[PDB]
């Protein structure tokens, strides 16, 4: 009928360190995802692992993630991010979607979800997205060197992503793409960087103690968040004021006027939207550009579609995407082979059976969403970039085999907007450029928050 947590297989619990010893000898935390995939190959779909006192059970199969979904809490919960909450408490700001829990989370989630995860409303953003892409492409052919290579492509892809989502979120152009207008968002963006490189140092050492002792990390983290909030508020206020007498004209006013979220609540929620959006979206664009340079046949099949559905250099539109099944399949394939987010996390709020294992309340689960990419039950030749696998109707790919955006009600809220931006960015890029590999040397995926390349990506942009 049922076995329990103790009967779970898994790696040796080495004295004091647990699997931390193995990780420090297998590449470090940067390579953690390679190690977890190795473990799922050894012990199968479900296993138990300790990293110091950090004890977790890993789920690495489509059936397990289906089971977890069918039985999930009405308010699913990830691992707590203490430093962000400590800052909000200290400064009396609201929590956003990433740190909210319970009915408080559901309230904000519903309100935003009806705007963000509605195709009809999302497609309305395309004009804005195209305005930013137009500018980005213009900047691209300025940055391209002699042989079509863009120095620090990741950084530039981030500039686009930032500018794109800020137009969507704040109806403003921050001017990341035109030089001379570069030093406007400068302090805002540096504050984001400072914040990102600092909150991680307060997750082992308790944030309460950093606060009590008034450490330099606590100080830097507080200043960085202050600056982020001080930059966001006026934008949201101006947008709120602009449409205060036009119900139905703006997703943000409607939320404010009809769902009754306070301005304080909107500051936190919009802020977390932006933080979640920027790097991950740029990261995904990057990986697809890399997969394209490595698969000229797939890139050719893609070029044909773009040129077929958009003769001349016709500005892409959201409605055109309906007739580009291959474009959309390239993105899915890229996210399966080279995902941005390697895993997510859940704390169980009630006893539940997964596999033939009964897991108690309080069990921390890591959903290895990456490892799903290599299961031969769903992907024959899983090490091959083949977008075709998504288009053939003579074999079902099980939806719980492909989860780059997580699962269930607490899954990524930005899915449609991210897809829309990526789809259109691909149209603009391929339309103008051939994506060529500049070398054939090894490139590795490092876990640095998200999965990033081990080095500058060997790709060039050759004006077609």
Ligand X SMILES: C[C@H](CCC(=O)NCCC[N+](C)(C)CCCS(=O)(=O)[O-])[C@H]1CC[C@H]2[C@@H]3[C@H](O)C[C@@H]4C[C@H](O)CC[C@]4(C)[C@H]3C[C@H](O)[C@]12C
Residues that bind ligand HEM (CB under 6 A): 78, 97-98, 109, 272-273, 276-277, 280-281, 284, 340-341, 344, 404-407, 410-414, 417-418
Q: Please enumerate in sequence order all residues whose Cβ is within 8 A of that of 387, keeping only pairs 6 or more positions apart, or say none.
A: 298, 301, 326, 329, 330, 332, 333
Which of ligand X, ligand HEM, none sits in contact with 452, Cβ below 5 to 8 A by type?
ligand X
**What distance in Å separates the CA atoms of residue 338 and residue 333, rounded to the nearest whole number?**
8
Residue nearer to ligand X on the CB measure, 386 or 402: 402
In angstroms, give the least distance from the CB of 340 to ligand HEM.
Answer: 5
Residue nearer to ligand HEM on the CB measure, 48 or 410: 410
Distances in Å between the Cα of 15 and the Cα atoms of 8, 26, 142, 309, 359 are 19, 17, 56, 61, 25
Q: Dihedrals φ, ψ of 349, to 5°?
A: -95, 5
Which of ligand X, ligand HEM, none sits in contact with 397, Cβ below 5 to 8 A by type?
none
Residue nearer to ligand X on the CB measure, 84 or 428: 84
Q: Is 412 annotated as a binding residue?
A: yes
Residue nearer to ligand X on the CB measure, 213 or 249: 213
Residue nearer to ligand HEM on the CB measure, 265 or 272: 272
**What distance in Å separates the CA atoms of residue 449 and residue 431, rounded to the nearest whole number?**
32
**What distance in Å separates the CA atoms of residue 379 and residue 442, rounded to the nearest whole number?**
23
Which of ligand X, ligand HEM, none sits in contact with 196, Cβ below 5 to 8 A by type?
ligand X
Neighbours of 38 (CB within 10 A): 14
In angstroms, give the least distance from the CB of 108 to ligand X.
Answer: 15
HSE (side-chain half, CA atoms, 13 Å) at 284: 26
Which of ligand HEM, ligand X, none sits in contact with 158, Cβ below 5 to 8 A by type?
ligand X
Neighbours of 199 (CB within 10 A): 21
In angstroms, give the least distance from the CB of 14 to ligand X.
Answer: 15
Residues that bind ligand X (CB under 6 A): 29, 51, 54, 78-80, 82, 98, 154-155, 158, 196, 200, 203-204, 209, 213, 275-276, 279-280, 341, 344-345, 448-450, 452
Which of ligand X, ligand HEM, none sits in contact with 284, Cβ below 5 to 8 A by type?
ligand HEM
Closest C-alpha to 228, from 274, 172, 182: 274
In angstroms, give the least distance from the CB of 263 to ligand X.
Answer: 24
Tokens 């789920």 locate to: 59
Cβ(461)–Cβ(148) under 8 Å? Answer: yes
Residue nearer to ligand X on the CB measure, 120 or 204: 204
In angstroms, give the least distance from the CB of 431 to ligand X.
Answer: 24
Dihedral of the alpha carbons of 131, 458, 460, 309, in degrees to the nearest 10: -60
3-state secondary structure 173-223: CCCCCCCCCCCCCHHHHHHHHHHHCCHHHHCCCCHHHHHHHCCHHHHHHHH
Cβ(458)–Cβ(439) under 8 Å? Answer: yes
In angstroms, give the least distance from the CB of 84 to ligand HEM.
Answer: 12
Residue nearer to ligand X on the CB measure, 79 or 310: 79
In angstroms, give the least distance from the CB of 436 to ligand HEM.
Answer: 24
Q: Which residues make up each annotated binding site?
A: 412
Binding-site members for heme are 412
């Amino acid at each position: 009928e049922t076995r329990n947590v103790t009967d779970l297989p898994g790696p040796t619990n080495w004295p004091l360190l647990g699997s931390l010893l193995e990780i420090f000898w297998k590449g470090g935390l940067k390579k953690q995802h390679d190690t977890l995939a190795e473990y799922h190959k050894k012990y199968g779909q479900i296993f138990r692992m300790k990293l110091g006192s950090f004890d977790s059970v890993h789920l690495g199969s489509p059936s397990l993630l289906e089971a977890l979904y069918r039985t999930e809490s009405a308010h699913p919960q990830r691992l707590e991010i203490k430093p962000w909450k400590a800052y909000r408490d200290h400064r009396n700001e609201a929590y956003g979607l990433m740190i909210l829990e319970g009915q408080e989370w559901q309230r904000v989630r519903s309100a935003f979800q009806k705007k963000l995860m509605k195709p009809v409303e999302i497609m309305k953003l395309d004009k804005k997205i195209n305005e930013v892409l137009a500018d980005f492409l213009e900047r691209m052919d300025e940055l391209c060197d002699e042989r079509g290579r863009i120095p620090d492509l990741y950084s530039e892809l981030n500039k686009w992503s930032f500018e794109s989502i800020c137009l969507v979120l704040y109806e403003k152009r921050f001017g990341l793409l035109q030089k001379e207008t570069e030093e406007e968002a400068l302090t805002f963006i540096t504050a984001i960087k400072t914040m990102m490189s600092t909150f991680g140092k307060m997750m082992v050492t308790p944030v309460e103690l950093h606060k009590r002792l008034n450490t330099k990390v606590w100080q830097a983290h507080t200043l960085a968040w202050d600056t982020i909030f001080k930059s966001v508020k006026p934008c949201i206020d101006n947008r709120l004021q602009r449409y205060s007498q036009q119900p139905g004209a703006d997703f943000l006013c409607d939320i404010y006027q009809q769902d009754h979220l306070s301005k304080k609540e909107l500051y936190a929620a919009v802020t977390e939207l932006q933080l979640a959006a920027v790097e991950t979206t740029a990261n995904s664009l990057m990986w697809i550009l890399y997969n394209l340079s490595r698969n000229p046949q797939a890139q050719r099949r893609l070029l044909q579609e773009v040129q077929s559905v958009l003769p001349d250099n016709q500005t892409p539109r959201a409605e055109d995407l309906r007739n580009m099944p291959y474009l959309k399949a390239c993105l899915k394939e890229s996210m399966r082979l080279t995902p941005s987010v390697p895993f997510t996390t859940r704390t169980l709020d009630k006893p539940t059976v997964l596999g033939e294992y009964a897991l108690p309340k309080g069990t921390v689960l890591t959903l290895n969403t990456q490892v799903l990419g290599s299961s031969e039950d769903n992907f024959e030749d899983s090490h091959k970039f083949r977008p075709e696998r998504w288009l053939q109707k003579e074999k079902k790919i099980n939806p719980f085999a492909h989860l780059p955006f997580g699962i269930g009600k607490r899954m990524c809220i930005g899915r449609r907007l991210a897809e829309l931006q990526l789809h259109l960015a691909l149209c603009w890029i391929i339309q103008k450029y051939d994506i060529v590999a500049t070398d054939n040397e090894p490139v590795e995926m490092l876990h640095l928050g998200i999965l990033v390349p081990s080095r500058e990506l060997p790709i060039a942009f050759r004006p077609r």
